[PDB]
Amino acid sequence: GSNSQVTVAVRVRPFSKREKTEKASQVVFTNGEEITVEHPDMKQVYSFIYDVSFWSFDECHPGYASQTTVYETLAAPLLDRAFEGYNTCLFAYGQTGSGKSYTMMGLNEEPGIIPRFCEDLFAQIAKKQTSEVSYHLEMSFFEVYNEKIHDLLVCKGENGQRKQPLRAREHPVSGPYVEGLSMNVVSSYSDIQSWLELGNKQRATAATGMNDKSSRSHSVFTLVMTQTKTEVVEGEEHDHRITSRINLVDLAGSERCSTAHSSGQRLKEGVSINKSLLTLGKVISALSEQANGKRVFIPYRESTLTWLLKESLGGNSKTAMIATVSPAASNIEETLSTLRYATQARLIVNIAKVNEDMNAKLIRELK
Amino acid sequence: NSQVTVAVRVRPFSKREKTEKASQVVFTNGEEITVEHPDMKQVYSFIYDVSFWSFDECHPGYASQTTVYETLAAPLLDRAFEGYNTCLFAYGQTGSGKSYTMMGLNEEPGIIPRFCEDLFAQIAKKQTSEVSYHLEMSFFEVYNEKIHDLLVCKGENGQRKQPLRAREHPVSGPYVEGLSMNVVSSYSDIQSWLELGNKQRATAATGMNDKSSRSHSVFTLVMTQTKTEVVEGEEHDHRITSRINLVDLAGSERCSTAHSSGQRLKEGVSINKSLLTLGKVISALSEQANGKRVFIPYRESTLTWLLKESLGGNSKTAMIATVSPAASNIEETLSTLRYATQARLIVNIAKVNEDMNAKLIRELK
Numbered sequence: 001g002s003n004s005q006v007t008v009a010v011r012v013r014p015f016s017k018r019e020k021t022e023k024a025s026q027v028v029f030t031n032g033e034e035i036t037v038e039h040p041d042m043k044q045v046y047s048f049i050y051d052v053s054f055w056s057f058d059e060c061h062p063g064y065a066s067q068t069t070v071y072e073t074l075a076a077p078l079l080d081r082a083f084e085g086y087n088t089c090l091f092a093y094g095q096t097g098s099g100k101s102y103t104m105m106g107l108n109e110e111p112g113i114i115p116r117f118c119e120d121l122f123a124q125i126a127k128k129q130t131s132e133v134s135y136h137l138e139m140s141f142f143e144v145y146n147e148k149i150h151d152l153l154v155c156k157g158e159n160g161q162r163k164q165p166l167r168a169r170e171h172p173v174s175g176p177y178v179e180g181l182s183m184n185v186v187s188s189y190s191d192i193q194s195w196l197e198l199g200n201k202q203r204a205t206a207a208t209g210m211n212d213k214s215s216r217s218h219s220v221f222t223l224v225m226t227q228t229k230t231e232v233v234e235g236e237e238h239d240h241r242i243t244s245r246i247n248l249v250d251l252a253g254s255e256r257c258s259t260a261h262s263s264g265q266r267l268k269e270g271v272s273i274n275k276s277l278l279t280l281g282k283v284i285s286a287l288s289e290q291a292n293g294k295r296v297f298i299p300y301r302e303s304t305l306t307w308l309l310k311e312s313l314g315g316n317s318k319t320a321m322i323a324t325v326s327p328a329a330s331n332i333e334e335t336l337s338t339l340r341y342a343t344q345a346r347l348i349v350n351i352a353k354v355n356e357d358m359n360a361k362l363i364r365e366l367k
Numbered sequence: 368n369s370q371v372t373v374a375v376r377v378r379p380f381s382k383r384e385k386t387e388k389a390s391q392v393v394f395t396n397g398e399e400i401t402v403e404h405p406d407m408k409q410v411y412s413f414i415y416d417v418s419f420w421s422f423d424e425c426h427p428g429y430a431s432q433t434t435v436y437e438t439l440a441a442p443l444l445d446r447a448f449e450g451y452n453t454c455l456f457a458y459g460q461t462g463s464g465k466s467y468t469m470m471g472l473n474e475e476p477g478i479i480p481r482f483c484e485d486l487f488a489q490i491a492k493k494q495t496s497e498v499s500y501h502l503e504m505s506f507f508e509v510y511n512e513k514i515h516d517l518l519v520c521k522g523e524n525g526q527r528k529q530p531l532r533a534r535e536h537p538v539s540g541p542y543v544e545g546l547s548m549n550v551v552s553s554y555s556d557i558q559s560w561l562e563l564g565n566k567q568r569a570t571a572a573t574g575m576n577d578k579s580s581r582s583h584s585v586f587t588l589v590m591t592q593t594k595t596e597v598v599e600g601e602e603h604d605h606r607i608t609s610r611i612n613l614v615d616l617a618g619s620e621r622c623s624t625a626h627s628s629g630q631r632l633k634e635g636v637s638i639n640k641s642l643l644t645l646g647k648v649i650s651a652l653s654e655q656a657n658g659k660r661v662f663i664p665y666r667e668s669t670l671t672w673l674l675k676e677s678l679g680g681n682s683k684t685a686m687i688a689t690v691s692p693a694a695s696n697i698e699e700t701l702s703t704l705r706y707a708t709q710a711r712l713i714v715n716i717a718k719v720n721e722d723m724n725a726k727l728i729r730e731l732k
């Protein structure tokens with residue numbers, strides 16, 4: 001393997017009914033590809049640079065970045081690396097009502113990165129479905145809710161108390177994993193769609209002040225893609241095997257407990273989300289400081305999300321993130337925090353390698 | 368001058384074991400034989416003077432019935448016609464194939480028929496007006512250190528196990544008093560007598576089988592050569608004799624696992640004792656052949672005492688131990704192997720052959 005950096009992208013969503021009703025001023029502007037922010041105080045205008053910038057604010061202007069465009073700019077390269085045998089990770093970040101549960105999954109009329117990636121992967125595999133390489137796909141779809149793990153592809157029993165919790169455990173080599181996760185086999189995009197629909201029907205959502213359907217649980221969508229390649233060997237064939245993992249992550253939002261006025265369960269889950277995001281920010285800052293040659297420890301273990309995504313934020317995977325921000329003045333502080341974490345995520349690098357899985361058999365040694 | 372030829376035969380699976388997928392625990396490496404437990408804890412290694420791996424018909428050196436005969440038994444005929452006494456012992460637990468090797472089927476014969484028919488053939492070839500041959504046979508059994516005959520008709524009684532005695536003729540060595548001896552001219556007669564006797568041989572349905580042998584069977588052929596030589600007159604009476612003995616031993620069997628009370632226990636005890644004395648005599652004979660000064664305890668058991676003149680001296684002894692490769696019979700297998708061994712058992716432990724594919728160490732080198 002060799003060093004590769006985390007691909008950071010940004011997306012400015014358009015005004016919503018709330019920012020229109022309580023009429024607010026546009027503050028986010030794109031200077032070509034830079035993203036600029038003109039504070040109402042007018043002390044200065046901040047300017048942030050990113051590997052990619054997307055302007056889905058307008059629906060007319062040259063620069064309109066639609067869902068297919070976001071796909072063909074971010075997700076297709078990860079599919080290339082997955083076919084190359086690398087693990088890949090993509091995760092969303094942002095505050096409430098920024099469009100993280102839209103960019104990734106999308107609506108029934110404007111699908112997101114998840115359906116586009118799955119369909120494109122299956123189609124490329126069918127195109128390349130020669131007798132040389134036999135392909136296999138497995139999937140899982142789990143969530144995190146008040147620091148508890150839940151399986152989304154497991155239909156709840158005949159009760160309300162059915163969110164049967166699992167637990168995380170560290171395999172000494174493969175790293176963290178979830179015990180009891182119903183991995184399911186994937187033939188094609190239709191079955192993927194059915195499973196995903198069942199999952200999103202099971203996921204924890206709720207209405208609030210700043211969203212009618214907000215996600216109160218982090219979501220991880222994992223694919224395991226196995227290529228068993230045929231080769232002319234003097235003995236038994238089909239030893240060449242490449243196993244690659246794709247991990248797509250829809251996180252929850254910051255949510256100050258004033259705008260999104262809540263009480264009880266809404267508040268409790270709002271607190272847990274906030275703590276998870278704090279730990280994530282600490283991890284990102286620590287990896288950025290690692291990239292500058294200092295000595296730092298990464299608090300992976302302070303939360304289940306970072307624990308189960310340890311090998312992706314750093315570790316061994318081609319990683320990318322999509323920051324989501326609103327263009328209004330009422331969300332200026334959260335926009336700036338998100339943009340700062342995004343830009344200091346760019347300095348992260350991770351050592352991704354091809355997962356040959358032939359250590360101490362013959363082939364990694366022959367290499 | 369003598370030497371014990373020790374041979375060990377590993378049978379193949381049967382249809383029942385192949386159906387049940389009974390595992391394999393006996394393996395080969397050329398001459399050596401090994402036992403590797405299913406627990407992967409210990410590896411026992413045995414060496415014998417000859418091995419017969421009848422496990423798979425494809426492997427090179429698959430021991431055919433003809434191979435077994437021509438390797439173990441037939442040189443005994445050479446020594447017999449040379450004028451020297453011979454003994455062939457057969458040992459093996461039930462289910463090992465101790466009969467298939469020795470007596471055999473109607474289609475795949477064994478040591479006994481190949482031996483007898485080759486004997487008849489060589490006799491017919493050597494028969495002239497000057498030299499003649501004469502063959503007598505006897506068939507007795509040993510049960511609780513007592514002798515019985517197998518070639519008489521059971522009289523009209525609840526039991527007619529008439530015992531006999533052993534006596535030491537000062538010249539002819541020991542012998543059995545009152546034993547009937549019959550003349551033979553063909554394998555038809557031999558087969559008829561044997562098929563009569565093996566209905567009288569003591570057998571009972573123990574835990575391990577419906578018919579397990581509880582007596583040591585001795586089948587003796589006395590072959591007399593009458594030749595003539597010039598004595599300045601009528602050439603007459605230059606006489607030689609040779610004794611062939613074929614012994615079928617019974618199985619050991621422990622009585623601590625196989626709970627067994629009464630007559631079964633007495634039988635097993637006597638079997639165990641006779642086999643112990645037999646092993647002592649055999650090892651003493653090996654040391655004598657290797658040149659030490661040794662005392663051979665022929666007299667501590669009836670079988671050894673009766674076969675004294677056919678183990679020691681310028682006589683030729685062979686032993687064939689039959690074993691099964693399955694795992695369920697592993698205690699019997701290890702026991703028979705240890706019994707047949709004459710020099711020493713070798714023991715190691717190894718689980719390092721599985722080198723994760725295609726001998727990984729080669730590319731490491």
Ligand SMILES: Nc1ncnc2c1ncn2[C@@H]1O[C@H](COP(=O)(O)OP(=O)(O)NP(=O)(O)O)[C@@H](O)[C@H]1O
Pocket residue numbers: 013014056094095096097098099100101102103211213214215216251252253324
């Ligand atoms: N490019 C866009 N154009 C129009 N509407 C958009 C766009 N992006 C997001 N939205 C709107 O955003 C709303 C909520 O977005 P959503 O996907 O829930 O963001 P979110 O980050 O998932 N909120 P949360 O659940 O707290 O994480 C939807 O009702 C969409 O109509």
Ligand SMILES: Nc1ncnc2c1ncn2[C@@H]1O[C@H](COP(=O)(O)OP(=O)(O)NP(=O)(O)O)[C@@H](O)[C@H]1O
Pocket residue numbers: 378379381421459460461462463464465466467468
């Ligand atoms: N060398 C061999 N090759 C192939 N099959 C064999 C061989 N030896 C024995 N068998 C088979 O295994 C059977 C064992 O002999 P058989 O007399 O039927 O039972 P048994 O238990 O060996 N009798 P016994 O040994 O006196 O208790 C034979 O009948 C054959 O079917």
Ligand SMILES: [Mg+2]
Pocket residue numbers: 100101214215251252253
């Ligand atoms: Mg959401």
